[PDB]
């Protein structure tokens, strides 16, 4: 039904003083039957790029018949 | 690939009855045969397959109550000796398999009763009064629901116990004539 | 030395302190205040407006009225705990400093309602569960995939348990074979036979 | 979706995205708690997903070139 | 009797606790509902006057290794009057 | 020795049973003896050696119904090299609520969001584990973090105040 | 006193319908019990409850087998030929009312007799697969069925399943065997 | 220790000095109302309608006065310290006296309100005990196994929680013996010194 | 561990029973037929659940007709 | 104390000297006792060549009957007179009856302990711990100075082999009320003992 | 109302100047009264909306309240004659997923609290690189 | 007697149990573990059991006399299982006995005099089974049915599938 995302940069952590690890967060509002559920995920840069390419492929394959 | 018992040929004629009867005992509720007794003759991943095949074949044969010949003909391509062992095993303890099958029919429900225990006590005194003398029956239940065993407890006095016995006897008056 | 209405033990300190507060009232108003608190114990209900109005004459504040009601309930329940009678309780209260008039006035109502109070205390004593009701259904199976022909019965049972007063009841459900049902009935009858010889 | 109970026939594209999730063992107890999910999408939701992700990608590229 | 006003009020509190165990004077019945609004009001008002770090320590005060001085310095960032 | 080994939490039932079997001792007497020794030692170890001198110790232990040769063992166990261990484990009995086991964090810098092209809002992610086995993970914005830090500093200051007052207000 | 029984009928039928709602239909929220007492002031000072017990007894008595109305009149007369018994016209009136709520009563009894999850609707779908991430060409079809299951008085659960040709055929065969077993057991 | 007020908070107290004490008393009553019956900004609309006075600054003044009262009762500081603190606000001596009196008359109620902000921990509410002896079971028919049943009630953040337990006479004796030691330390020299030198 | 064929569930076995309810506490002549079903199903984890429910004759014949229609539709294309 | 027909037939057969001698009877009785008692038993209970002359069917039927009789007697706490009378009604002699009574007496205590170890119970407490504190302040309250008591119960559930601990916080008045309640329970126990 | 809310969401997403609104909304056949009502309101409380969104959170758990209590422990079952301070912290974690609030009860000594304070100071030093 | 003697026995037991003081569980002999705890309490469970029968009708007797059929008490590993299963087996046997030959009262033994084996009872339960099977025979046509709609099923086979997709298609992201 609905989706949200947040794109940001890490600037530190408990065991590393300095790091610039990029990340992406997603929330998926999936209709689990009559109720509703939210699925929270985190992706890295290569995983996000592969996901985008796979979605492009799915869009290409989803408009073949009509 | 023929009858599901085709995997049984590897086992010699001597060690057949033990495996078969211990499998039937496992079906009825006792333990099942262990790997370290026939490991040389089969591999575990296929030992499970042959175990399940034997169990399900026996259950189907007993449930559908086949005649002698049709059971005989399905075992034509087995060992020259295993056939009579199988048929004698069916002839001996068919009733136990039928009882287990009938018990499993009651498994078609939300929950089933496994076993129970009751304890009787005499309540002497409490903070409210010191002349109580109240007999109390404690009933413990172990009811299996979904895939887990859930314990329950009920505390009853004489009146509740009498009413429960009355209702259960009313039900038993129907159960006894339904047979 | 000691007193009996406290179970053959020395009388507590708070009751001793607050009985004097009880003693600074009128006996007739006590005959209604003790009646109200006794009815509250009996389960009829309590009208705090009634007691506040009744003791409004003496301008007793929150602490004093609170202690008075607490003492009334505590002492009455303790006296009924050991089936103590009015004649002994009046003397014991006199030993506690309460004037004879107040002891007579209170025992006028205490002595004439002990039976309902004691039976209610017996009913409302400690307990963990109670079987509110029971329901059953009988099934007769005819055919199944596992077994072509069965022709045997089944019993369904439901038990409703009240874990506390003013609480929702959590039902219990189960499915039984005929054999388990019969053995359960026989064992219940045995327990009843053992459990009916204690009276 | 060729047919359904409430309609004898059609021919409509549909998507079934399945994913794998690994959660920290600490946050779930003593279990590894690796779950799989499935979401059934349509054309409009996929289009919105792709537009948003392409917008994010364009933002990233602009930042890179800036 | 003077020390009673400080710590000798035990018996009255004991009796009040005994009474309140099974009883609820009507004034206190709706007080339980009034409590939540009282706490919401006090937390919100404290939010209004929350002590906020609008002030800073001059950079370079990192030499201290103590459990008494650096905590004192830390509170200076919030400008709170002590 | 068995009673002492029990005070550190070790299970030593079987050795006690073997001793009872060997010495032909009814359980009713062995249990009473064990309970007496355990209670006596527990009450003895509550106090520090400064509040319980050996003199008063054996004077209270006064011979009536008492052997003379056992008080030496009692003193040796109480005042021996095992006392530090007993105090250390005894100190561990003074705990009610869980203690912090670990603390890990991660600070992010939100650049973009679905509801905002450029957010640019620093944020902190916090994870906490407790000795009870509980694990907690949550976000914590900046203002709330400042509130938490100020509260911690204030608690440190007040704890220092109490530490100072303890010596000054109880050595008069 | 002889109030209502031989005089007012409206309170009596109102009480019967209120009891039907309270004990069979599972709507005990607001009933006429609390309104008739202060709107009809004919409450007997002493004997007021026990006649409600006979109300309940007659209500449960007919609820056993639901016989033909020809045989209900005989039992109604036999039970009600005594003091305070119902009239012939009132006997006909109540006999009619059973027809007015017979099927609803039976359904509520069966509904208030369930012990396991019940089927509350079937919704299915049949699709044709095209391709996947790695596979580039597929045509094998599938079927999707979702089951509405739920025990009475509880939130419904949903179950989803997948199928192909062989499993659908097997399930059809099993259901056909079920039908055959149903057919052969009548005689 | 002393209310050395903040400058920004003081700026919100500038409305009252330009206001007569007649409405300052009403504002204090409004602060008490906000604590007890809760806050309703609609009262700002009512005040504007009945006085043609801006709602924003009235809200600022009432919240500032309430905050002053809360942090003044939160410490129980003496009256002289309060008089010293408010001497910096440039307030009339009559208004200062009114503020000090209003603060004085509503300290205990406020401190009763504030005590519900501390962390909520499980707390004892009531305890019930029943005595029973086991006589029979499904495996043994004649038995004697006495036990003590206990129902312990605890309150956590405003809810009622119940626990069902069991024990034997020796364990009950040990419990009483230990808990008696628990409340025997408060009568000792160490506890007395700690509780006396602090206050 | 990634396969497209299994997405949500796949039932591994199908068992049923036929019986009728004879009597009840609130009714001594209940006497209506019913048919029950037991499904044990496997998810992606490889486990096996057990879901059981009860039906009536009209519901069962509706079930059978719907599965028949599904078979026809899937066969045609 | 009721018994079934099959057990009656088994005990009828047990009396015949042709079927069993004294040695065979003693061995069967001891084998039944071992099967009932030992937790590491096997088919070896009947692998004693002295018994290898009678049909196993009767052997095992009588074995089951004897085990059932011992179980019933233990459950009903039967004594010498009841066993002797029933065995006499079974057409026994003064030798077999004496040996049966002696075998019952030899390991009666273990059988009494075994049947008393079946069943569940409510959680059983074992000990307590307490911490004494002196509350000072909270975030929104700055001067209280009130002692408070921390309590911790050690209980073990027969349902789950673990030692969960229950914790609650008490004040002095609550602690006094709790101690009074426990003392009342103790006095009730003493009253029961005196009677 | 949904269309107006969507327009406002777009405007705050792009953080547009009111001139952009005045120019663009009128292009889609909207009468001038609507455009003026939009632009005046956008000028009124626009930056408040973006600041509000800037503090928005996506994770299902947030820290909402902080409370603490200070106690002095003096004796217990296995020891006596103590003068040890202790501290308790309560954390208000809002489980936005369940629309409910839980609470975490933690306990500290002086050394543990000092270590916690040092960790928080390190986190603060991390946040100070973004000036 | 019992109403007082039972109280005296209870009092004696309580006194004896009070005599023993409390000891830490780590130093608890099994007797005290029984007294001052419940750590060694097992539950009640019954397992299905098979017993030899004094019926020599043939083939099954070969199994009954073989080592394959273990002795009845030793068919389960744990002794508690043994005792529980044996007790339930005896109780069920006696219950089946109650519905069989039983020297009962002046009226309950009346039917036992001339009762054929489960044959004379069949006449008056055949009536109940008649109602059961006639209720089953109904609803197979009473409502909903007939369901004969052999029009939606097989016609689809004749027509088949007419259209199909072409070549792989794609476009540029918007």
Residue numbers in the entry:
A (entry chain G): 135 to 200
B (entry chain H): 5 to 183
C (entry chain D), H (entry chain B): 1 to 199
D (entry chain I): 133 to 198
E (entry chain N): 128 to 209
F (entry chain E): 53 to 224
G (entry chain A): 1 to 187
I (entry chain F): 9 to 85
Q: Any passages from the paper?
A:
The Commander complex is required for endosomal recycling of diverse transmembrane cargos and is mutated in Ritscher-Schinzel syndrome. The COMMD proteins form a distinctive hetero-decameric ring stabilized by extensive interactions with CCDC22 and CCDC93. These adopt a coiled-coil structure that connects the CCC and Retriever assemblies and recruits a 16th subunit, DENND10, to form the complete Commander complex.
Purified BS3-crosslinked CCC dodecameric complex was vitrified on graphene-oxide coated grids for single particle cryoEM. Several rounds of 3D particle classification with and without alignment combined with 3D refinement yielded a reconstruction with overall resolution of 3.5 Å. Although the complex studied by cryoEM includes the full-length CCDC proteins, no density is observed for the CH domain of CCDC22 or the C-terminal coiled-coil domains of either protein, indicating significant flexibility in their relative orientation to the COMMD ring. In this structure, the CCDC22 and CCDC93 linkers make extensive contacts with the central COMM domain ring and the peripheral HN domains, while the CCDC93 CH domain is partly stabilized by direct interactions with the COMMD ring via the HN domain of COMMD4. The extensive interactions mediated by the linker regions of the CCDC proteins appears to enhance the stability of the COMMD ring and likely explains why only tetrameric sub-complexes are isolated when expressing the COMMD proteins alone in E. coli.
